[PDB]
Amino acid sequence: PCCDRCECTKSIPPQCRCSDVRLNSCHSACKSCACTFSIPAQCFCGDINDFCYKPC
Amino acid sequence: IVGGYTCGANTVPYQVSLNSGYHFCGGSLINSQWVVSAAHCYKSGIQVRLGEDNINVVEGNEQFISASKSIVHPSYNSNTLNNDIMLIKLKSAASLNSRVASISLPTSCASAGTQCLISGWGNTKSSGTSYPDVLKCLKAPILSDSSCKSAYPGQITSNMFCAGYLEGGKDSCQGDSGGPVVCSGKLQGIVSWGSGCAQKNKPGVYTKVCNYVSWIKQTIASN
Numbered sequence: 001p002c003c004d005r006c007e008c009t010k011s012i013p014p015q016c017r018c019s020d021v022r023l024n025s026c027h028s029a030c031k032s033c034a035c036t037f038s039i040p041a042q043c044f045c046g047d048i049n050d051f052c053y054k055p056c
Numbered sequence: 057i058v059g060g061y062t063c064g065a066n067t068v069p070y071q072v073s074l075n076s077g078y079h080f081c082g083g084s085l086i087n088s089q090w091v092v093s094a095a096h097c098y099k100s101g102i103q104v105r106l107g108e109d110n111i112n113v114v115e116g117n118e119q120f121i122s123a124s125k126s127i128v129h130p131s132y133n134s135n136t137l138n139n140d141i142m143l144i145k146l147k148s149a150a151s152l153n154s155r156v157a158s159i160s161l162p163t164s165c166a167s168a169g170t171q172c173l174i175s176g177w178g179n180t181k182s183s184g185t186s187y188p189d190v191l192k193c194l195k196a197p198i199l200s201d202s203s204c205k206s207a208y209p210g211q212i213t214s215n216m217f218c219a220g221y222l223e224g225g226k227d228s229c230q231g232d233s234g235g236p237v238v239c240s241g242k243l244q245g246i247v248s249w250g251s252g253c254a255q256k257n258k259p260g261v262y263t264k265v266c267n268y269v270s271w272i273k274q275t276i277a278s279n
């Protein structure tokens with residue numbers, strides 16, 4: 001899985017999210033891929049982690 | 057703080073360390089019993105450490121006071137980090153002196169170009185990790201919302217601003233969250249989030265304190 005736009009809070013632990021919006025899918029490691037109900041769907045991963053995935 | 061400088065002991069007397077097991081966020085003392093920090097810095101067991109410089113050595117000017125009340129902004133949204141502000145009431149009032157002092161709340165908002173002082177014990181490396189013993193400081197300007205929104209499309213609300221340097225190299229970083237952005241002696245920002253630290257084109261994002269002054273005052277008055 002990869003993420004191009006990763007942002008984190010500046011706390012310890014960091015709380016990071018991938019803000020990538022992708023058509024129809026999120027990255028392969030995403031546990032909560034939130035999509036619009038459009039055609040095509042725009043989706044982004046809601047997961048909060050203490051890391052960023054590598055760039056795509 | 058990446059690309060900053062050693063402040064000097066107790067030269068930022070309103071800076072506090074929030075400690076719950078370890079230092080995990082900063083905060084700003086706004087009167088003897090209240091600290092402003094980020095909502096995302098809420099954690100169990102917070103001890104507020106005032107008068108710190110070297111957070112790993114008792115130097116003799118510290119006051120360690122347990123947090124007694126957390127008041128996270130009622131509109132804080134962890135999904136967006138909008139309204140990323142929290143008040144912490146100290147269990148007992150801090151003793152205010154040269155080395156422990158409050159910072160004034162703003163009467164008006166700062167805007168692009170305002171020069172500020174950002175401080176904290178956060179990571180000093182943009183790549184990798186190095187955690188300082190002593191407090192670090194960074195002079196940084198507030199940036200145009202155009203630059204801020206361009207850097208973070210769809211994420212910058214009216215309660216945030218960016219500050220720092222688009223060229224990279226100077227920024228707040230992990231461990232700085234909740235800490236102060238002080239501009240002309242007023243607390244205008246709270247370290248909140250960003251894409252990494254000190255990366256080119258990715259300035260730090262900060263909670264816009266001036267939007268919360270009424271809520272802060274009402275909250276302190278009622279709690």
Ligand SMILES: [Ca+2]
Nearest residue numbers: 110113114115
């Ligand atoms: Ca100390």
